[PDB]
Design an enzyme around this catalytic site. Structure first.
Site, mmCIF file in Angstrom:
data_model
loop_
_atom_site.group_PDB
_atom_site.id
_atom_site.type_symbol
_atom_site.label_atom_id
_atom_site.label_comp_id
_atom_site.label_asym_id
_atom_site.label_seq_id
_atom_site.Cartn_x
_atom_site.Cartn_y
_atom_site.Cartn_z
ATOM 1 N N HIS A 1 0.911 -2.888 10.072
ATOM 2 C CA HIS A 1 2.223 -3.175 9.720
ATOM 3 C C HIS A 1 3.418 -2.595 10.705
ATOM 4 O O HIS A 1 2.817 -1.640 11.239
ATOM 5 C CB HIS A 1 2.496 -2.670 8.354
ATOM 6 C CG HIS A 1 1.881 -3.395 7.037
ATOM 7 N ND1 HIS A 1 0.501 -2.701 6.699
ATOM 8 C CD2 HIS A 1 2.266 -4.425 6.703
ATOM 9 C CE1 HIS A 1 0.719 -3.760 5.481
ATOM 10 N NE2 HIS A 1 1.400 -4.794 5.574
ATOM 11 N N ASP B 1 8.668 -1.784 8.425
ATOM 12 C CA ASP B 1 8.373 -2.313 7.183
ATOM 13 C C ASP B 1 7.889 -0.951 6.639
ATOM 14 O O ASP B 1 8.298 -0.671 5.231
ATOM 15 C CB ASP B 1 7.148 -3.286 7.310
ATOM 16 C CG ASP B 1 7.544 -4.665 7.900
ATOM 17 O OD1 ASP B 1 8.668 -4.658 8.178
ATOM 18 O OD2 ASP B 1 6.818 -5.314 8.014
ATOM 19 N N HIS C 1 0.831 -1.337 0.135
ATOM 20 C CA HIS C 1 0.200 -0.075 0.116
ATOM 21 C C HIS C 1 0.898 1.176 -0.182
ATOM 22 O O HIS C 1 0.723 2.125 -0.765
ATOM 23 C CB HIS C 1 -0.884 -0.021 1.277
ATOM 24 C CG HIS C 1 -2.032 -1.010 1.169
ATOM 25 N ND1 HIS C 1 -1.603 -2.450 1.389
ATOM 26 C CD2 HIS C 1 -3.282 -1.086 0.963
ATOM 27 C CE1 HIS C 1 -2.586 -3.233 1.359
ATOM 28 N NE2 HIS C 1 -3.603 -2.395 1.199
HETATM 29 C C1 LIG Z 1 -2.671 0.786 -9.975
HETATM 30 C C2 LIG Z 1 -1.928 -0.621 -9.391
HETATM 31 C C3 LIG Z 1 -2.628 -1.064 -8.268
HETATM 32 C C4 LIG Z 1 -2.198 -2.374 -7.549
HETATM 33 C C5 LIG Z 1 -2.209 -2.254 -6.144
HETATM 34 C C6 LIG Z 1 -2.413 -3.680 -5.586
HETATM 35 C C7 LIG Z 1 -2.950 -4.849 -6.530
HETATM 36 C C8 LIG Z 1 -2.669 -6.211 -6.256
HETATM 37 C C9 LIG Z 1 -1.460 -6.650 -6.107
HETATM 38 C C10 LIG Z 1 -1.131 -8.153 -6.471
HETATM 39 C C11 LIG Z 1 -1.495 -9.173 -5.614
HETATM 40 C C12 LIG Z 1 -1.137 -9.057 -4.034
HETATM 41 C C13 LIG Z 1 -2.366 -8.544 -3.344
HETATM 42 C C14 LIG Z 1 -2.169 -7.804 -2.263
HETATM 43 C C15 LIG Z 1 -0.805 -7.099 -2.073
HETATM 44 O O1 LIG Z 1 -0.265 -6.275 -2.903
HETATM 45 C C16 LIG Z 1 -0.880 -5.993 -0.851
HETATM 46 C C17 LIG Z 1 -1.055 -7.005 0.722
HETATM 47 O O2 LIG Z 1 -1.737 -6.201 1.559
HETATM 48 N N1 LIG Z 1 -2.248 -5.559 -0.866
HETATM 49 C C18 LIG Z 1 -2.086 -4.312 -1.965
HETATM 50 O O3 LIG Z 1 -1.344 -3.966 -2.407
HETATM 51 C C19 LIG Z 1 -3.377 -3.410 -1.989
HETATM 52 C C20 LIG Z 1 -3.258 -2.095 -2.225
HETATM 53 C C21 LIG Z 1 -4.528 -1.396 -2.425
HETATM 54 C C22 LIG Z 1 -4.352 0.191 -2.027
HETATM 55 C C23 LIG Z 1 -3.887 0.821 -3.267
HETATM 56 C C24 LIG Z 1 -4.922 2.162 -3.645
HETATM 57 C C25 LIG Z 1 -4.901 2.437 -5.056
HETATM 58 C C26 LIG Z 1 -6.332 2.449 -5.683
HETATM 59 C C27 LIG Z 1 -6.036 1.933 -7.338
HETATM 60 C C28 LIG Z 1 -7.299 0.973 -7.777
HETATM 61 C C29 LIG Z 1 -7.050 0.939 -9.437
#
Ligand SMILES: CCCCCCCCCCCC/C=C\[C@@H](O)[C@H](CO)NC(=O)CCCCCCCCCCC
Ligand SMILES: CCCCCCCCCCCC/C=C\[C@@H](O)[C@H](CO)NC(=O)CCCCCCCCCCC
Ligand SMILES: CCCCCCCCCCCC/C=C\[C@@H](O)[C@H](CO)NC(=O)CCCCCCCCCCC
Ligand SMILES: CCCCCCCCCCCC/C=C\[C@@H](O)[C@H](CO)NC(=O)CCCCCCCCCCC
Ligand SMILES: CCCCCCCCCCCC/C=C\[C@@H](O)[C@H](CO)NC(=O)CCCCCCCCCCC
Ligand SMILES: CCCCCCCCCCCC/C=C\[C@@H](O)[C@H](CO)NC(=O)CCCCCCCCCCC
Lengths: 264, 264, 264, 264, 264, 264
Positions: free
Chosen positions: E201, E205, E158
């Protein structure tokens, strides 16, 4: 050059009329702050104690008043810049009466005992003070057409009007008639003596009124002749509606005489 | 060239002293023409009815007076042309107090009710008039050194002295010191306000005093700077002994300051 | 060249409306943080303790505000560059009221005891707080149209509006009308004195409001006149939406007057 | 040429001592205007309501002040133009404390409930009021040596001293030491935060004190650097005793370091 | 010359998608190494002990992420060289999330006690691990669209997304909008503070995440601007597919903005 | 030129000694924040779960550290600018250990299960924690001279010291001895393997320490060689006492070797 403006004289006339109305209304309001104002004995003065009361002291003073206006409007008729004359006279009169109103509001000083018989008094309400104001407005203040029924206050207007008329008459004629000037001077002094001997005003009141009108008239004429209303930012002239009146006139007004009738 | 005439300052001081004695004597005549002066009801004003009487407000004005006079003496000490300043100051005060004598002689205007407990009265004779005259003269009229026991009259001199000293202090300092000027103006305003709030004089009294002092001071300074005493027969100046007093100095007095003591 | 852009003034008006709505909502929220705010004894002030309460002294402030608004509308009607004036006034008022919101939320300083009769209170929810905010917004906050029923908090807005309108009227008129300027100054001072003597705000609130409005106005106009919005990276001007509004205008705005109506 | 005037620094120190004594006396007399000042519920603040009181949070401010004073003394010791720095610091602090006196006499803003155990009170007379003033003066107002026993009023002085010393330390060091500057900024911010979190002053008091000290310091130094004390009559600088102290110094003060001791 | 290559953006986006799928794969695999992972006592910090948990502090971070993303696409739309920006951003995120995968693979650090009620666990097999991996992938990992049911691991993503979007907003929007940059920095700081105070967290980190994102972003920008991909064999840059991506682009990307719609 | 300064290396020695003492004291105080620290089960990591604990794993790493400093002092003895090495080594070690202190204070991460038998604990007083600090200071932390009796925290100092010594040894020899460099590298990786297999630290802690020491050493050497400490105000280097140490040295330090004994 000297262009005769015909749409500014009426503005001066309405201005001086509003000034007179405000003066009358302030007089009416101030006449309320003391109920009786006729029981106290008079303050010790030098002049009013020697000469006894002369009942008819007012008549000749005011009749000399209309003589002064008569000569004034005869000089008005046959002089070519009549518009500037009527533009200056009202513009000075309004300012002098505004100063009279301010002095009236600050301090009240009357003659204790004259017109002890005027009736009426205690008009406490909004509707009818306007009636008194309108009466003393469209009565024009003479004692012949009875409006001036009781006493009078500081800064008499009779002295101011007489002196202003005398000065305006004596200043706008050619400098070779030194017999009418003397007549006007003795006439004005006779009027002053008679109003003072009427026991209605104190010597200091008449004296400061005369000094104020003389100083204001001379100051206005000197400023107009010098032409400092546009020369520079000299002294930020405080005269009400001064620059808006004399901006169209440059230099000193001449004294040429003519006749506005095409029927000789 | 500026020639310091040390034989004319003594004449000016003597003239001022006899003027003050004459003023005391005229006041001696004035305050006996009506016996009581204390049974009358007060005349209606705007500032003598709202603010109640304050019994310590008459000595702060004087305290400001001594402050201003001390500042003026300090300015006088460190000035090259001290004689000219001391000459002009006395010449001004003489004329102002002559005007005060005249205006007190023409009319008497008092405050009806204050200092009603002052004793004396009915002092009809010739012998002991000079007694109270000398007392008031060599008591200098302060309320601290008790002389001012009964009431005061038209054209108060306290405001005259305060305004004259204030304008003299602001006039003859270099034109970059207008922080002392603010203090002097504040002192003059406080003195006027306390005189008004001490129920000692009417509002018009203070206003005409302030205006006449300012006008005479500024007019005399303009006349002296324009060196019109001998340039031409302009108006036949009405100042007591003006051509005699200012003839030996030409032009405007500079602002050069020195130290008269030769012991560093 | 001065380009009158008509598509930015609407944005400025919308910005001011949004700021006013936000201020109303913030005041509504702040009024809840203290339960009573009407039982405490008032803090010792030097103006609130000398002059008793005057019940009618609050409407005169709004009368002076109305007079100033009428004069400002008259000035805006007869100006060549009306659009720039209307864009500047709104851009200043928005920032000042945002500062008012910030200093109201930081600390709440009310007057404990005035308008103690106002009813309502404890409207706790999301649905009807917006009703109070809408009432205060579309009631214009004046006491004539009764919306201002309870007390007011720090950084009063009446003084802000009066001072801003007075400064805009004074500065955007030709530098030869120095009686309108005195009239506007007198009106502003009387409005401030009446809001202080009506027991509505502490002295420090009015003083800091006056100082903040004066400083913001002078700083913004100095920055606009010095063309410092594009000269260099001097200070990164912190005025909200400043460079956007004045990018197209170079130099200083002149004072040309005309008549937008084409039917003489 | 930079001429170190050794006879003006004593005058500045005397001026600061007089100002401090006056401030102590005015605080003593102000403390009597409200009898209790310890029973009212506290005003709702956003910092005084989130962080409970910390008993030991007040000594940290004075520790930071002493550290800053030691650093400033070290800077003064190793500077060529020490006299000008000592003459500027006092001339600024005197004016700021005079402003504090004015704004705490105008209105009183105390914290209702802290130091509620302090004894004494109602020492009404002239003989022992000066004893309290002497104690507050020759106790330096620090809480380590117990003099500050009861509450404090608006426009706190701790923030003023901290900000002034921090600005003097930051500005009068070579512009390459940007870790000492960060340390001083951190110390000042921590001192302000502990002042706010010790439940001693409202947030608005600290904010306005910080803003006033910053603005006065920047304005004075800008005027000194631009050399406006003799260029012309621009605005008549209102700093008390300003032109006298900086008349002999031209341009800007350089930053050359030396060692006054002649025994390496 | 800047030649927009539209056949390379698709490859970069596909690479990022496989990177995200591999990240979900690694997280799912690592989650099986510790069965319970919720009975441990919390590790002692300085910021996880003072401020208590807030249940609504985890969605404000994602709100800030969403608004920052919206601002980012707004910047993307109005840019001439949109393809280069979209190529660089995805190339950066791929490497950052590869490092994130590595740092979870070497070690696992979690918060012991939050999301202890999440169901599932002991899913030991090959077939349906793909199901949870696909759910995490095409749920995008927000807590609003519930996928993030259990705890999170070291090096939170995040903060990575927030910091990357913030730095991209501040670098590729011209260097003088220094008000949007302040808003983006405030948003990033608030997001960091909320993710820290949500008991999600450990502080270290968050700090290492912020540092690695800032370092990688600045290093990539410096490498691209200096054009070191073909100048010489300096260090054989380790970035996944860097030379194949920026070979066409020469020099620094300008900041010319246009409108791709041809319908005004 | 390269002048040997012999009065600055003693400053480096005292600085690094104070840093060591501060680190020991911080470790002592922070060890109190968790009473037991020996009941939790170990966190899941890839490496300590595969290979079982080797009881004799600590010794060889530390004796290899002795070998490293042995070759370091051998290179020191026969090189001419030994002063500059003794200045740089301590100046870097102090900063690295300050970073270790900061990261140790922010977060504590230990091994839950090793050195369960160290006795003592709960030293609640002022007096005797200084005794423990002095013991672990003048025991220098070896496991041979028994001071290190229980567990260690994040950012292990052994890895930092080993890497720093290896880098300093390998950089300050002529670039033709590529067999001692290989010995030092394999020796360092052997030490890292053995200490990380002693079940004494996590993989992330060792990796972070190694990366931080490598980056800081390379950054410091690049800054020294580039000679940007006086070229301009590039980035205002935050290294503790950087410009003070390297201002007397210009350019790169050569590798000329000599013998300081005059007895061949
Ligand atoms: C524009 C790109 C946005 C991508 C953000 C995360 C997408 C999933 C990453 C890959 C899968 C792993 C899953 C989760 C992990 O990554 C971590 C663990 O807590 N959770 C995350 O990151 C979730 C972060 C959400 C907050 C970001 C706010 C921006 C909103 C944009 C939406 C279009
Ligand atoms: C050409 C100028 C004409 C002016 C005529 C003055 C009329 C003023 C009346 C307004 C009401 C205000 C009330 C009172 C004051 O006015 C004072 C107080 O006693 N009364 C007055 O002054 C009355 C003045 C009488 C002598 C005038 C002689 C000139 C005659 C011109 C007539 C056409
Ligand atoms: C340097 C000139 C000093 C003159 C001061 C007054 C001298 C007047 C004497 C003439 C006789 C008339 C007596 C009194 C009348 O004048 C009026 C009537 O109320 N009282 C007065 O004036 C008294 C005014 C006192 C205030 C002066 C303060 C300045 C202090 C300087 C002292 C050296
Ligand atoms: C020409 C500019 C007109 C601006 C008028 C603003 C009206 C309220 C909008 C702000 C909403 C917040 C509500 C209240 C607070 O703002 C404070 C509370 O005391 N009330 C106010 O400030 C109200 C201002 C009264 C003096 C205005 C006199 C000028 C007359 C012009 C009207 C056409
Ligand atoms: C180097 C500057 C020295 C200034 C010291 C001033 C001492 C008091 C003189 C003023 C008399 C009025 C009494 C109290 C009020 O002023 C306020 C009340 O809260 N107390 C104060 O401000 C005292 C400020 C304490 C913090 C200063 C820390 C710096 C250390 C230098 C110490 C010698
Ligand atoms: C020339 C460099 C000499 C450095 C000697 C370091 C000794 C004290 C380090 C700082 C004080 C804090 C105490 C302990 C912690 O740091 C950690 C605890 O696990 N122990 C350490 O790091 C000690 C690392 C020992 C391995 C290196 C061997 C070479 C020593 C050469 C000395 C002649």
């Amino acid at each position: 050059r000297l262009d005769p403006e015909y749409w500014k004289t009426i503005l001066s006339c309405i201005y001086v009329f509003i000034v007179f109305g405000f003066t009358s209304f302030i007089m009416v309001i101030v006449h309320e702050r003391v109920p009786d104002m006729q029981t106290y004995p008079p303050l010790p003065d030098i002049f009013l104690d020697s000469v006894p009361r002369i009942p008819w002291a007012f008549a000749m003073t005011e009749v000399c008043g209309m003589i002064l206006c008569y000569i004034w409007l005869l000089v008005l008729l046959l002089h070519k810049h009549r518009s500037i004359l009527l533009r200056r006279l009202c513009s000075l009169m309004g300012t002098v009466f505004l100063l009279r109103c301010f002095t009236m509001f600050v301090t009240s000083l009357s003659v204790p005992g004259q017109h002890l018989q005027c009736t009426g008094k205690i008009y406490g309400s909004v509707w009818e003070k306007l009636h008194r104001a309108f009466a003393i407005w469209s009565g024009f203040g003479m004692t012949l057409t009875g409006v001036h029924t009781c006493g009078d206050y500081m800064f008499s207007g009779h002295t101011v009007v007489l002196t202003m008329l005398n000065f305006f008459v004596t200043e706008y004629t050619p400098r070779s008639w030194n017999f009418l000037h003397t007549l006007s001077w003795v006439l004005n002094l006779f009027g002053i003596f008679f109003i003072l001997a009427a026991h209605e005003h104190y010597s200091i009141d008449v004296f400061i009124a005369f000094y104020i009108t003389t100083r204001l008239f001379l100051y206005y004429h000197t400023l107009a002749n010098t032409r400092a209303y546009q020369q520079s930012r000299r002294a930020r002239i405080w005269f009400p509606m001064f620059s808006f009146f004399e901006c169209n006139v440059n230099g000193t007004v001449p004294n040429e005489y003519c006749w506005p009738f095409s029927k000789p």
